[PDB]
Amino acid sequence: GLMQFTLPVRLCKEIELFHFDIGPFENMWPGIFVYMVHRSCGTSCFELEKLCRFIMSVKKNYRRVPYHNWKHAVTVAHCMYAILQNNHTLFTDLERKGLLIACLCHDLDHRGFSNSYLQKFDHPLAALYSTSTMEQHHFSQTVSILQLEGHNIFSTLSSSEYEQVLEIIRKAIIATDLALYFGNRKQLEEMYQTGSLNLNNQSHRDRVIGLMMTACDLCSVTKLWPVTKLTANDIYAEFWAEGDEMKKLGIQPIPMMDRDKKDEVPQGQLGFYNAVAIPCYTTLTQILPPTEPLLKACRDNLSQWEKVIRGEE
Numbered sequence: 001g002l003m004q005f006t007l008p009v010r011l012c013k014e015i016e017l018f019h020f021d022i023g024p025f026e027n028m029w030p031g032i033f034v035y036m037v038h039r040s041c042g043t044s045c046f047e048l049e050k051l052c053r054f055i056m057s058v059k060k061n062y063r064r065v066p067y068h069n070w071k072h073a074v075t076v077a078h079c080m081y082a083i084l085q086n087n088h089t090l091f092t093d094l095e096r097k098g099l100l101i102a103c104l105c106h107d108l109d110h111r112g113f114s115n116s117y118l119q120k121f122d123h124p125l126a127a128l129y130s131t132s133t134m135e136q137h138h139f140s141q142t143v144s145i146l147q148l149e150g151h152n153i154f155s156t157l158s159s160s161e162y163e164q165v166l167e168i169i170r171k172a173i174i175a176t177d178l179a180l181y182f183g184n185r186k187q188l189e190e191m192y193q194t195g196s197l198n199l200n201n202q203s204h205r206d207r208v209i210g211l212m213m214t215a216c217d218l219c220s221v222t223k224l225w226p227v228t229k230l231t232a233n234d235i236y237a238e239f240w241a242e243g244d245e246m247k248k249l250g251i252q253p254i255p256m257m258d259r260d261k262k263d264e265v266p267q268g269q270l271g272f273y274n275a276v277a278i279p280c281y282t283t284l285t286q287i288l289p290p291t292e293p294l295l296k297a298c299r300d301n302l303s304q305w306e307k308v309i310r311g312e313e
Ligand SMILES: CN(C)c1nc(CC[C@H]2CCN(c3ccccn3)C2)nc2ccc(Cl)cc12
Pocket: 178, 217, 218, 219, 220, 221, 235, 255, 256, 257, 261, 262, 263, 264, 265, 266, 267, 268, 269, 271, 272
């Protein structure tokens, strides 16, 4: 009740900034998350014992893969925390509750392989869920953990409020399928530019939350350059293992998954920043002006990849 979480001074200040890195001490990550829920949502949002039990079962259901691991989950939740704290009055009580949970759960039980690889392997999940294959699995694992004894963090919500928060979570998790982002951002671009964007329209709020989810999921491109560059190593460790598995199925992988083509990483990152990252944070900054530091840090990192190519690093 009167039991606040407090962080050391450096973390207490820097956790408020978009570019915060949660650090290599895994045992501090639960406390960092609870800290963020208490300031973002309130100390009354969740029963501490249930929230702590939920966080630890979530952790246990992330795998020891190079990138789509527990550290990614907490990192994506912190980017959402920073967006929510910079946009105090724009979000509902239920949205504040739902979105940090959605971010912590958005990659539950990821194996380090894309939807394409599951479909080419003919994995059972690809027959259960024909599109957004891993994202439907991540939502299925979130409902499983919510239903374990002593893990219903939403127990005090009415039936209809409980259904609404699980619907915010389902949409926020599905929206992390990058295949869905391209069309979502185009519609948001048209809506903002013809002045039709309306934050009282539920279907429009859903689009804006979807874009927030892409922005938080891609937030490694918005860190300080040494964090961005070292994270890229983990991202490629997975891509290249997937390429190896494609080659075992007798399929030449695309170049971003082929370790024989490491030399092309700098130009590949360039395309990604130009086609995905910069557009994402540009549209987000137009809808939510106080998120501009994400766009600025992305532009800084695009310019670092240009330097890599020019042989200045
Ligand atoms: C979101 N996710 C799919 C991401 N995909 C890529 C790959 C771009 C790829 C486009 C081309 N590609 C190549 C091509 C040849 C050799 C090497 N790479 C990289 N880079 C990312 C970086 C940061 C984050 Cl946070 C997410 C991603």
